[PDB]
């Protein structure tokens, strides 16, 4: 019922006069729809959904101008952080930036995001209230000052509360069956085993959208973290996503253990059991 | 739709 627009930005410095790598990708929910990439030989914002391709030369020229503005801004941000931390000319460093909105079942909701990370650590991030900043170290405390004194916070909101939502909404409409579908998990189980007095149980879940999903594992109605081999939810690459949850059990004790598949696109949670 | 305004650290 909830949705999200989010842009992800990745700037990497390249020692010795080299212009940095810059990658920008735009997601609506869990579905990438645009990318910029300094490496690639278009040097325009490229469409990566098929539903955003209908937008006219105006929008594209438009986004391109902004992404080229964003790129140059991050080339500078790199130079600046190298300065703040007194790091050297000879290291490569990484600025990551994510901003975007959340909407509700309503589509007229707000949660706003705009945060940074330098070399894998958090740097500065706009708090939930959208008027305040959280500043990691002194170096970030410098940026907090600049951005309080400049009223950056209040300028963000005009986008986060405004055009972000408006265009999120606009996209969810045109996306149609793509963006607003809720593909259900096809689920089953396995019994491969490399012992006599042990046995392995895998609770599979394939071909589901959106990505978010819950694969609990209870012994006789009590959740178990112990032995519960859970992998990151992975993309099948067709648009759906995959996730399995393993548990090792002793032989002849698999009549006890039950799976629990919660997903957004299910009528009720699907309790599961091994079958001879 | 990207943010129209950019900001420096």
């Amino acid at each position: 019922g909830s949705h999200s627009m989010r842009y992800f930005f990745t700037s990497v410095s390249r020692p010795g006069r080299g212009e940095p790598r810059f990658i920008a990708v735009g997601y609506v929910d869990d579905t990438q729809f645009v990318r910029f990439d300094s490496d690639a030989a278009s040097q325009r914002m490229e469409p990566r959904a098929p539903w955003i391709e209908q937008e006219g030369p105006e929008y594209w020229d438009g986004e391109t101008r902004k992404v080229k503005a964003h790129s140059q801004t991050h080339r500078v941000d790199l130079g600046t952080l190298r300065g703040y931390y007194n790091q050297s000319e000879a290291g490569s460093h990484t600025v990551q930036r994510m901003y975007g909105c959340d909407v509700g079942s309503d589509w007229r909701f707000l949660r706003g995001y705009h945060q940074y990370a330098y070399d894998g650590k958090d740097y500065i991030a706009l708090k939930e209230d959208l008027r305040s900043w959280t500043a990691a170290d002194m170096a970030a405390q410098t940026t907090k000052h600049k951005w309080e004194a400049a009223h950056v916070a209040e300028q963000l909101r005009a986008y986060l509360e405004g055009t972000c939502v408006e265009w999120l909404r606009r996209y969810l409409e045109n996306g149609k069956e793509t963006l607003q579908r809720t593909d259900a998990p096809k689920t089953h189980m396995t019994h491969h085993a490399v012992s006599d007095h042990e046995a392995t149980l895998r609770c599979w879940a394939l071909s589901f959208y959106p990505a978010e999903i819950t694969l609990t594992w209870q012994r006789d109605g009590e959740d178990q973290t112990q032995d519960t081999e859970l992998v990151e939810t992975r993309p099948a690459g067709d648009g759906t996503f995959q996730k399995w949850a393993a548990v090792v059990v002793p032989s002849g004790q698999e009549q006890r253990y039950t799976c629990h598949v919660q997903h957004e696109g299910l009528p009720k949670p699907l309790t599961l059991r091994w079958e001879p | 739709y990207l943010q129209p305004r950019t900001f420096l650290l």
């Epitope: 503005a69 009223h151 | 950019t6």
Partner: T-cell receptor, first 107, second 113 residues
Framework: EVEQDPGPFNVPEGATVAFNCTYS??????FFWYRQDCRLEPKLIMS???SGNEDGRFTAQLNRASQYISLLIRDSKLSDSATYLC??????????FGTGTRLQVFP | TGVSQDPRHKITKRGQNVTFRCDPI?????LYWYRQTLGQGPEFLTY????????KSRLLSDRFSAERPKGSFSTLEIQRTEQGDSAMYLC???????????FGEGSRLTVLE
């Protein structure tokens, strides 16, 4: 298009004058009042945020909803005589002036 | 401290080139070229961030070009001048975090036949 009262405001001192300005794109996130003496350059009066910006005789508000920003000079003074310029960003970082609203304060 | 332009006035003969210089406030990254004809508001020409020239308007012809080779001083250059070019050519340095323009006293170009 940044649009603002075309007609010149000729008023006597003591008077209270209100400038209206509106911007076309909802995109704009940065809003300004500049003031310009006749044969000189434009100077910043005021950055315009939602919270009632209360200078001395000057107060401006921003109505993002109706994409409209205003200015209210309380006690008109001979020295307030200048063209008052409305400025917002347009699609990018770039900053775009309205045509200006001229003020002459008689004594 | 502020933005400083040279020259303040230049009279030029129709079809001669002119070159306006601008030395801004160091700390501000962005630098803006506007142009004002008597009675209208300032028309955007082009803005830089450091050495980079992010945007320039339809209104700036072939004849008009502006460099900012380092992050610092910028030049505007009008070629084969026409009477229509006659205007105040305003240089402004600008905060990136706020959008505050800090104008010089401009260069008045009057072009005559």
């Amino acid at each position: 298009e940044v649009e603002q009262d075309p007609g010149p405001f000729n008023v006597p001192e003591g008077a209270t004058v209100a400038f209206n300005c509106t911007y076309s794109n909802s995109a704009s996130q940065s809003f300004f009042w500049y003031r310009q003496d006749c044969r000189l350059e434009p100077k910043l009066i005021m950055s315009v945020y939602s919270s009632g910006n209360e200078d001395g005789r000057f107060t401006a508000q921003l109505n993002r909803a109706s994409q409209y920003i205003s200015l209210l000079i309380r006690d008109s003074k001979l020295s307030d005589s200048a063209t008052y310029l409305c400025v917002v960003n347009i699609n990018t970082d770039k900053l775009i002036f309205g045509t200006g609203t001229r003020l002459q304060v008689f004594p | 401290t502020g933005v400083s332009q040279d020259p303040r006035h230049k009279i030029t003969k129709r079809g001669q080139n002119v070159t306006f210089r601008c030395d801004p406030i160091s700390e501000h990254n962005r630098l803006y070229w506007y142009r004002q004809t008597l009675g209208q508001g300032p028309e955007f020409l082009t803005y830089f961030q450091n050495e980079a020239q992010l945007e320039k308007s339809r209104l700036l012809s072939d004849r008009f070009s502006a460099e900012r080779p380092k992050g610092s001083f910028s030049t505007l250059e009008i070629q084969r001048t026409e009477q229509g070019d006659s205007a105040m050519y305003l240089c402004a340095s600008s905060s990136a975090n706020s959008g505050e323009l800090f104008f010089g006293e401009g260069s008045r170009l009057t072009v005559l036949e």
